[PDB]
Design a protein around this ligand. Structure first.
Ligand code: CA
Lengths: 204, 207, 447, 208
């Protein structure tokens, strides 16, 4: 359920075939003081974060592959800043190529946002139906809380890149990422204190 | 326990734009009891994830498992190493097999077509011969043709190391004497990395 | 065994019967007439009863009671045909399989006085049941709405009962929801209003087993429905349960430029026409056209099936840029190449599209094999009668009509209403040292 | 533990009266600790004591190899008699037994054709004299070149190749200075096979 690698200074290689199956199902992975590690391959382990990995201690790094994981490497993500350190470590010893700094083909998992903004919504008396979920309670976030509101925002997210290298998996559909808002109910108490359960309101 | 064989691409596939070359990795004698076989592929020691593993095949109570990695023409021809790593429960340690193209100054094949021997002309079928010599490395492909159509009744020798360090072989197309005497033209096609567009053709007709 | 027996049925066997054992006695099936028929159809052993999973046809006026029929737990279909002396059907008499949609046929049940099918999740359902005195079809999954056949069958069951006395339970239905088989809209339209959702607007709703179409508000009206002022729907039955969630439904949009996208949203900024193919995940469930504003005229790929007339590379390979597919590529042993081609007639070219190396649908091709830079061209001499390699090779005979400067997976740009029969596409460079590939070239316009 | 390899005679040696054919038996990875290696030879299960064991040969530190060579009678080999080699050692659980005999099957006589250089090769300082041998079975064969009674030694022969009719074929390629070809010297391609009369034919090749 958890592996801590602490001050393993003579460990030079971490490959995914060395780590246990549980790493693909979110087992915890901490590593600190990995001063001898030259190859860090965590590819294809559905890693959702680079938490645990002390990137500053990996000073003998020459190659790494964190591709085919579930990372969010967007601009204002912690995981991008940890990747930047992994690349700086590599660049100290050898020219940065794609053959030694793989971070592509990420399929970051979707989560429900913790908070929604709208605290006071308003509609005109337009005699139209409106949907409270679509209008006010919508969107998906990553493990690093990067908000994607809609299909169009996901498109922009896919176009994101580090050093002109697109990190998101091309074959990764919005339908997969987004949350479905299944079994979400909307409880409406009127001014008459009458209660209904519906996301629809016809503004008569 | 399980054995591993790693086969290189067909030389025509590495040399022809119309074709897609493949390195193939075969694991034989896999037990029914511990059947899970994991493959890892490396190109100059760099892991690649684009391989394609075909499902088990009872070849009793013993399976075979093949994994096929597509290769880029340039990678092969630049002599990059392809490593196949096999894991199993009935293995003490994983098995690692590597193949690359033979390193060494490439040398252009010389193609000579030879007509039948006078003595063979007494027979109902005669032997059209194609000699290819002085080529390096030994990866080569030979085909026959006539009037634009493929001739298919032929056999080619494996490459043979000559005394000068290069290779040579013979291909032997068999035809009915009638077709030879009627004055049809036959072509010997040779495909090799040291030829322009990896291709030449020599003709052979009655003289 | 069990996997073989599953196919073979067309260890003891899970399904069907026992492996080729006490015989069926009156302790299992009391009625001798019923016992006889079940033995002939399912087998002669006790262990056959629990396993038999096909059809049982019971016939004749000899059968008095149906006790023991409950033991056929896996029975897939029960036909009761001319059982004139059968007087009672209770749910404890029928097999467990009736609760999981086993089929139930009955004809000529002239002696039946009590028909209890309660709590068997029956999704559907009378003229022969002329001796009826009570029935209970409550706690099923029936649709008893106005325009349903099941309501009309219920009305007969009540008329039968009313002939003998004033015993007519039909309440607490939780009808199952299904996706509608067809949607109406074949041609949708929006104004240029500057977001609309194609799924909510055109491909929406849930139906019953009897195709009664239901939003939340329509479901409310459905729940209020009643027969003789008796509400038949179960009160505790939520819309969330009934409705279909439309999960993993995708909308494939082909524009006038024949460009494809996958989204249910369209922001109506400009005049446009899309072809809409809506997919459940495995199949297309709806096609339609969608005009935004006045619309736009559908372009055609004029380059489709174009004749290759010259190329710096393999002539046969060049022909694969003008098939319908992205299942093969053209490249050369170099970073530059050209292909000249002939559309056969002069037509109006409005845009062009190149599908790059990574669009390959046969080998997973990395973007490093993409074409980085190229030029699309037309021949200068508008009307030259070609009778060739040296001519087409020479750059002086060609005028650029488009430039490519980006290693995009798909590259589309507009053309200045180009009228040209002869074209050439030059690859100027790749995205890496690897020799660049591409899979398809379109010249898009009106014929 | 020790392994055993049993090699057959060179096909020329079985076919030619001038030569004495030998079956050879090699024991590899013999330990320094228990070095005594006893060989027993059998011909159709009949013990023969005429074998000749060569002394041990250190391959690497403290590991030896031991070879035993049994002379065979041409007739015995060609009649397909079985040669069994039995090896004994202290570091073996039971003795090791390996057997070889001649390739069975209906013999087919080789057809020998000599082919001159290509006109195109005549632009070079050395040219290729070719000898085609086809339609022979089994694949045991030997090819040599000669000129003016002296052996020509600058040649290479392909391994036998299975043809589409079930027989074998090969090519031998003698390389000579163009000068010697043009001057009109005769070259001979000698083929040795069990299906030839006296296991021998010769085809000549000179400039026309
Ligand atoms: Ca194509």
């Amino acid at each position: 359920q958890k592996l801590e690698l602490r001050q393993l200074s003579n460990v030079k290689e971490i490959t995914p075939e060395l780590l246990p199956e549980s790493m693909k199902k979110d087992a915890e992975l901490v590593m600190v003081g990995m001063t001898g590690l030259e190859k860090l391959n965590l590819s294809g382990l559905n890693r959702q974060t680079l938490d645990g990995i002390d990137v500053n201690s990996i000073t003998h790094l020459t190659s790494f592959d964190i591709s085919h994981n579930s990372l969010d490497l967007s601009e204002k993500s912690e995981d991008r800043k940890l990747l930047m350190t992994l690349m700086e470590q590599v660049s100290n010893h050898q020219k940065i190529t794609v053959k030694n700094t793989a971070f592509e083909n990420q399929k970051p998992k979707g989560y429900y946002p913790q908070t929604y903004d709208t605290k006071e919504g308003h509609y005109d008396v337009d005699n139209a139906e409106h949907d409270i979920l679509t209008d006010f309670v919508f969107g998906t976030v990553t493990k690093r809380n990067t908000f994607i509101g809609d299909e169009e925002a996901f498109a922009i997210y896919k176009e994101g890149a580090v050093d002109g290298r697109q990190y998101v998996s091309k074959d990764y559909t919005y339908e997969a990422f987004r949350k479905d808002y299944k079994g979400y109910k909307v409880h409406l108490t009127a001014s008459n204190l009458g209660e209904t359960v519906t996301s629809k309101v016809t503004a008569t | 326990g399980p054995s591993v064989f790693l086969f290189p691409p067909k030389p025509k596939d590495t040399l022809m734009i119309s074709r897609t070359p493949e390195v193939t990795c075969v694991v034989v004698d896999v037990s029914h009891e511990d059947p899970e076989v994991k493959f890892n592929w490396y190109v100059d020691g760099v892991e690649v994830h684009n391989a394609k593993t075909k499902p088990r095949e009872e070849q009793n109570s013993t399976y075979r498992v093949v994994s096929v990695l597509t290769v880029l023409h340039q990678d092969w021809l630049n002599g990059k190493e392809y490593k196949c790593k096999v894991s199993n429960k009935a293995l003490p340690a994983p098995i690692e097999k590597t193949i690359s193209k033979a390193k060494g100054q490439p040398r252009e094949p010389q193609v000579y077509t030879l007509p039948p021997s006078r003595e063979e002309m007494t027979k109902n079928q005669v032997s059209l011969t194609c000699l290819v010599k002085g080529f390096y490395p030994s990866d080569i492909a030979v085909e026959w043709a006539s009037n634009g159509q493929p001739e298919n009744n032929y056999k080619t020798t494996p490459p043979v190391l000559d005394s000068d360090g290069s290779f040579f072989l013979y291909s032997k197309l068999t035809v009915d004497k009638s077709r030879w005497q009627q004055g049809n033209v036959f072509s010997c096609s040779v495909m090799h990395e040291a030829l322009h567009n990896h291709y030449t053709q020599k003709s052979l007709s009655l003289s | 065994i069990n996997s073989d027996w599953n196919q073979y049925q067309n260890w003891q066997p899970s399904t069907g019967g026992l492996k080729a054992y006490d015989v069926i006695d009156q302790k299992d099936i009391p009625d001798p007439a019923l016992r006889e028929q079940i033995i002939q159809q399912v087998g002669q052993y006790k262990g056959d009863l629990e396993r038999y999973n096909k059809t049982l046809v019971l016939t004749g006026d000899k059968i008095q009671n149906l006790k023991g029929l409950e033991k056929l737990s896996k029975l897939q279909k029960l036909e009761l045909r001319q059982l004139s002396n059968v007087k009672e059907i209770t749910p404890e008499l029928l097999p467990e399989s009736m609760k999981k949609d086993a089929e139930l046929v009955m004809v000529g049940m002239t002696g039946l006085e009590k028909l209890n099918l309660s709590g068997l999740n029956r999704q559907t359902l009378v003229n022969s049941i002329t001796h009826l005195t009570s029935f209970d079809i409550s706690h099923n999954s029936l649709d008893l709405s106005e325009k349903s056949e099941d309501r009309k069958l219920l009305m007969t069951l009540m008329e039968q009962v009313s002939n003998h006395q004033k015993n007519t339970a039909f309440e607490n239905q939780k009808p199952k929801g299904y996706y509608p088989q067809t949607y109406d809209t074949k041609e949708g339209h929006y104004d240029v209003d500057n977001e609309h959702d194609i799924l909510t607007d055109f491909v929406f709703g849930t139906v019953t087993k009897r195709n009664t179409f239901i939003d939340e508000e329509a479901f409310a009206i459905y729940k209020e429905g009643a027969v003789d002022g008796r509400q038949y729907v179960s009160k505790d039955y939520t819309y969330e349960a009934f409705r279909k969630d439309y999960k993993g439904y995708k909308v494939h949009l082909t524009a006038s430029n024949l460009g494809e996208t996958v989204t249910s949203k369209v922001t109506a900024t400009t005049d446009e026409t899309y072809l809409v193919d809506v997919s459940d995940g495995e199949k297309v469930v709806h096609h339609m056209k969608l005009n935004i504003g006045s619309g736009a005229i559908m372009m055609e790929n004029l380059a489709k099936g174009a004749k290759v007339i010259g190329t710096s590379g393999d002539f046969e390979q060049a022909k694969k840029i003008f098939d319908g597919e992205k299942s093969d590529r053209f490249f050369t042993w170099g970073q530059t190449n050209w292909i000249a081609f002939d559309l056969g007639e002069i037509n109006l070219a409005k845009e062009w599209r190149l599908f790059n190396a990574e669009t390959n649908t046969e080998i997973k091709t990395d973007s490093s094999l993409n074409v980085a830079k190229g030029r699309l061209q037309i021949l200068k001499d508008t009307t030259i009668d070609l009778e060739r390699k040296e001519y087409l090779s020479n750059d002086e005979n060609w005028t650029d009509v488009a430039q490519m400067d980006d290693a995009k997976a798909i590259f589309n740009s507009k053309l200045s209403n180009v009228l040209s029969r002869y074209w050439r596409f030059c690859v100027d460079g790749g995205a890496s040292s690897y020799y660049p590939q591409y899979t398809e070239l379109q010249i898009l316009g009106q014929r």
